[PDB]
Amino acid sequence: MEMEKEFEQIDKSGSWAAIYQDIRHEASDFPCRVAKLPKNKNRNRYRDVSPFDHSRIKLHQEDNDYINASLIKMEEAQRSYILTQGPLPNTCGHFWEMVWEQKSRGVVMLNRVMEKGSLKCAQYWPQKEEKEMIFEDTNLKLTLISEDIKSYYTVRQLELENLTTQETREILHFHYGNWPDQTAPESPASFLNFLFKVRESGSLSPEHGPVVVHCSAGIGRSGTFCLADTCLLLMDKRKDPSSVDIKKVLLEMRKFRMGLIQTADQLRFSYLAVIEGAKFIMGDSSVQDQWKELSHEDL
Numbered sequence: 001m002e003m004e005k006e007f008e009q010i011d012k013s014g015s016w017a018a019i020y021q022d023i024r025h026e027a028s029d030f031p032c033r034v035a036k037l038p039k040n041k042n043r044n045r046y047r048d049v050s051p052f053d054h055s056r057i058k059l060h061q062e063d064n065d066y067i068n069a070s071l072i073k074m075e076e077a078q079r080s081y082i083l084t085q086g087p088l089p090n091t092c093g094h095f096w097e098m099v100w101e102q103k104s105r106g107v108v109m110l111n112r113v114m115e116k117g118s119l120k121c122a123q124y125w126p127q128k129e130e131k132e133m134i135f136e137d138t139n140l141k142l143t144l145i146s147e148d149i150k151s152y153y154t155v156r157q158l159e160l161e162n163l164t165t166q167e168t169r170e171i172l173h174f175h176y177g178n179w180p181d182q183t184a185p186e187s188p189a190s191f192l193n194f195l196f197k198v199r200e201s202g203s204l205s206p207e208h209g210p211v212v213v214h215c216s217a218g219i220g221r222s223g224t225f226c227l228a229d230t231c232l233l234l235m236d237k238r239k240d241p242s243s244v245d246i247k248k249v250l251l252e253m254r255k256f257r258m259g260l261i262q263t264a265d266q267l268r269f270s271y272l273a274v275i276e277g278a279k280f281i282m283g284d285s286s287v288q289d290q291w292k293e294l295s296h297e298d299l
């Protein structure tokens, strides 16, 4: 409720840029010394996007434990996320080692491999059932089991095997197809339909490790996805939409990874998505089918 009154006041005053710049100014600044070591240069996709030392995910190998990935641990909401960059050709084994070690069940990919003429993420999962991937460095095998291709997103079932122990795990891949970099999703409905598909899969259960969320840099689209989810969860535990302070939640998330939400329009969209999602949280179950129909996911 209060977020909705704030939304209309910011909209009618045309001050989303100023509100967003305020968040940038107030955001935490913590050291990223490991990310900046010379030996880790080729493990970072972008020179200006690094994990903080205090929240970085450490790989369980004595050689080099570095991956560009951050644990966003939302204490009040009681949910954690791992936000990471799109893996590079040389860090795909590290990525799946992280998924294994952290016991994640879901990977949310919000970008395409090719965007705007450039390669934004390595092809880190197999595209054909009969062409499985072996990651020699980390001793992992990855097989495509099936995929469900909808109009704007795809859900894949993957099998991840630890070749040292022969244990296997099902990993769900939720792949958003039409959310461009530095933009907001096309509609709250299509975004919320996707978010609730991730939720319904069980991938966010506290019984599993944290869901892995990435785009190319792991901060813009990834931050928008996690901000909306966390705000809806906070509202859900209290059953009180007016108790959620979305800018405070975003500043809390930014204690764990720099730069989350990259444009003023992504911040504005986050308000829109949380305000709409609140209808479901507060007991209008029918609204979820409305999002699905407006999503045209079968067209």
Ligand code: VO4
Pocket (backbone or CB within 6 Å): 111, 181, 182, 215, 216, 217, 218, 219, 220, 221, 222, 262
């Ligand atoms: O590739 V993302 O720019 O949305 O951090």
Ligand SMILES: [Mg+2]
Pocket (backbone or CB within 6 Å): 002, 003, 006, 244, 245, 246, 247
């Ligand atoms: Mg507010």
